[PDB]
């Protein structure tokens, strides 16, 4: 529907990626963060909505980041066509999420309000989730 | 030094102070400070104005020219008027 998050293309058509597996990508900025866990990938529209939520329920300002950005398009072509001919026009952008990325992170608040806003996010995304504290990476050198 | 792209010069009398040589050099006739500088690769004799001692610039600060009578004068004038 809406695609605010965008960039210079460099190219407008691309073979997809479809996810298999990974871990990692701990928290580095804030304290509290959301961990995606499971089967899907994403468009930007979704992320925007989640940001609306996470900005409202936190008054007192309260800081947010998005560690990821969609670097990839999502093509989908005219309605009720026969297959065959050249790959279709643009409709979307994509930020793939294996199990282990950390989409949303916050700090400036307590442990609770974070957790609420993150519930109110994970209902508004495909992926199952998990709540995390920044206490440890798996490497510090 | 190529031969066909190189000009030359002439003109005229050497000096009085050193031996009576001209060493492919100048002869510089000035008025305020009157050094007959035999120091110039190209044309003498040169009816010039400065020796670099004339103006208070190359040598340095000097008395050379007032530049003074004006200010002071007008000042005293206006002063005595109201006085």
């Amino acid at each position: 529907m809406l695609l605010p998050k965008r960039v210079k293309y460099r190219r407008q058509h691309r073979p997809k990626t479809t996810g298999r597996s990974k871990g990692g990508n701990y928290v580095t900025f804030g304290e509290f963060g959301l961990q995606a866990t499971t089967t899907s990938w994403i468009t930007s529209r979704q992320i925007e909505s989640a940001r609306i939520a996470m900005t409202r329920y936190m008054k007192r300002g309260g800081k947010v980041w998005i560690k990821i950005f969609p670097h990839t398009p999502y093509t989908k072509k005219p309605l009720e066509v026969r297959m065959g001919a050249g790959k279709g026009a643009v409709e979307g952008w994509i930020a793939v999420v294996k199990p282990g990325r950390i989409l949303f992170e916050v700090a400036g608040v307590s442990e609770e309000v974070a957790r609420e806003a993150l519930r109110l996010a994970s209902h508004k995304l495909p992926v199952k989730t998990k709540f995390v504290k920044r206490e440890e990476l798996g490497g510090e050198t | 030094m190529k031969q066909g792209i190189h000009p030359e010069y002439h003109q005229v009398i050497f000096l009085d102070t050193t031996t009576n040589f001209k060493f492919l050099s100048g002869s510089t006739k000035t008025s305020s400070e009157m050094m007959e500088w035999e120091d110039g690769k190209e044309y003498p004799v040169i009816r010039l104005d400065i020796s670099s001692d004339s103006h208070p610039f190359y040598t340095g600060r000097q008395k050379f020219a007032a530049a003074d009578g004006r200010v002071e004068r007008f000042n005293k004038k206006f002063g005595l008027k109201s006085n």
Binding site: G23, G24, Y26, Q35, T37, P99, G100, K130, V132, E136, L137, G138, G139, E140, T141 | -
Partner: protein, 94 residues
């Protein structure tokens, strides 16, 4: 400073996932004292030992002969499972 240990055989085929499942843990220690060692260790008493001395404190790792003082370097944590793998020690200088 007190850790009960088994000594590892260094060819412990990918079924060592059993060890990690048992709460046991692999690790190594090196630096100034000796050349290289592979060990086992419990996770439980290790997370005790973190708070006990601190991150970079001086543990006396277990052998059976002389314990070696160490200043724990590194570990490779994994999310989605909430635990540690392959701790890294360091036999310090004096």
């Amino acid at each position: 400073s007190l850790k009960s240990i088994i000594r590892q055989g260094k060819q412990t085929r990918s079924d060592l996932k059993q060890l990690r499942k048992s709460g046991k843990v692999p690790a190594v220690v090196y630096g100034y004292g000796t050349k290289n060692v592979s060990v086992k260790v419990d996770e439980v008493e290790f997370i005790k030992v973190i708070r006990e001395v601190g991150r970079n404190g001086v543990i006396e790792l277990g052998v059976g002969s002389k314990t070696i003082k160490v200043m724990v370097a590194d570990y490779q944590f994994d999310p989605l499972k909430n635990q540690i793998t392959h701790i890294d020690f360091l036999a310090i200088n004096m």
